[PDB]
Amino acid sequence: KVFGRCELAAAMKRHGLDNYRGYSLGNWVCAAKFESNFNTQATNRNTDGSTDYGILQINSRWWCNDGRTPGSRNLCNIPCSALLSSDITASVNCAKKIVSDGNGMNAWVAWRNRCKGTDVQAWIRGCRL
């Protein structure tokens, strides 16, 4: 599924991401835009052999099992394919674990490089939330 900006903002809010660990909703929408272009089916292979999955590009080395990443820890206890669903629940639940892991949203390279320190609440402007 390819979400619209406001549609995704609303779904993320309903799943409790607004101000989760102090990160306002715009941060999450911005991260999703630059990680996946709002596409739940996005996948990208990394140089180390792991793969990133879904709207928030969650990595198979640590967070989910894709059956081809040796030494995967599968900390979210889910197959990576679950992160590609039109229903973002599994992605949100896993992301909550990631952002609680110490480095906050810096875990997402696109967030650090393209969202951090910008006016992220532009991402939710005009939305009926």
Biggest CA–CA distance in the chain, Å, is 44
Closest CB to Ni ion among residues 74, 127: 74
**For the stretch 12-33, what's the b/e string if a residue is b when 16 or more beta carbons lie within 10 angstroms of its beta carbon?**
bbebebbebeebbbbbbbbbbb
Does residue 79 bind Cl ion (CB under 5 A)? no
> Binding residue for Cl ion (CB under 5 A) from 10, 24, 104, 114?
104
Q: How far is the CB of 20 from Cl ion (least distance, A)?
A: 10
- Which residues does residue 20 pair with via DSSP β-bridges, in sequence order? 23
Binding of Ni ion by 66 (CB under 5 A): no
Should residue 52 be labelled a site residue for Ni ion when binding is judged by CB under 5 A? yes
Compose the 14-53 pattern: x for residues touching Cl ion by CB under 5 A, - for all others.
----------------------------------------
Which residues of the chain form contacts with Ni ion (CB under 5 A)?
A: 52, 57
